[PDB]
Amino acid sequence: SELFIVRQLLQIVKQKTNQNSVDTTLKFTLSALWNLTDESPTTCRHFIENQGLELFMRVLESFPTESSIQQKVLGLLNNIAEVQELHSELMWKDFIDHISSLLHSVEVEVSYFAAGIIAHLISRGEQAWTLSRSQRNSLLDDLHSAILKWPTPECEMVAYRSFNPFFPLLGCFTTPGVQLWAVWAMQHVCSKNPSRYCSMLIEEGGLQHLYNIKDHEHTDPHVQQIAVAILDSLEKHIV
């Protein structure tokens, strides 16, 4: 029944995209589909098995100027990128080249998910990247530098029910842009809404994973400089 909902909302996205129609129903449909796939690999398989990926490429292409539409689409894809079993699905050139471009989007609400997709796909290692090896390395440093250009969002862009997705990213020491995205993302949601996340970031093991970054011999100065900024609010949250 929830897969029916996903299929039906996907149907609305298909409909609105065929008619190239940016409107509150499409924007709400993406948001809905973004939520239904959160922390839901099962609802992510359906998005994928129901051609969501190719449909969302169509949305990204159809509405290259629609930053809200891009954010919600990428939001969903950020959720697919959290599922390892769905890695080879996003290993699609035309998709990554587009994501890779939205990585440099000025909209921070857009590039954040672009980066988070990228970060999750890079985080899977050298082997899992079935796309151009040169591009993955171009992304590796483009992902890093894109984050450094980012502004503080005006408000909370994304909501998280857990930080566990970010935890395996904290250990990508060979790929600091991946770690940079993770720590920036926690730095964002925590600082934006510390009454939500700060307790939970501790309660899931964030302290140690963040301490294994600050007090880590070889760590990118920026990745550490964010883990410092997070731990200051975390340690302030403890006392």
């Binding site: 973004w34 994304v158 998280y160 857990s162």
Partner: peptide, 7 residues
């Protein structure tokens, strides 16, 4: 993960 916007 989740969208901040409700409904």
């Amino acid at each position: 993960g989740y969208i901040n916007v409700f409904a």
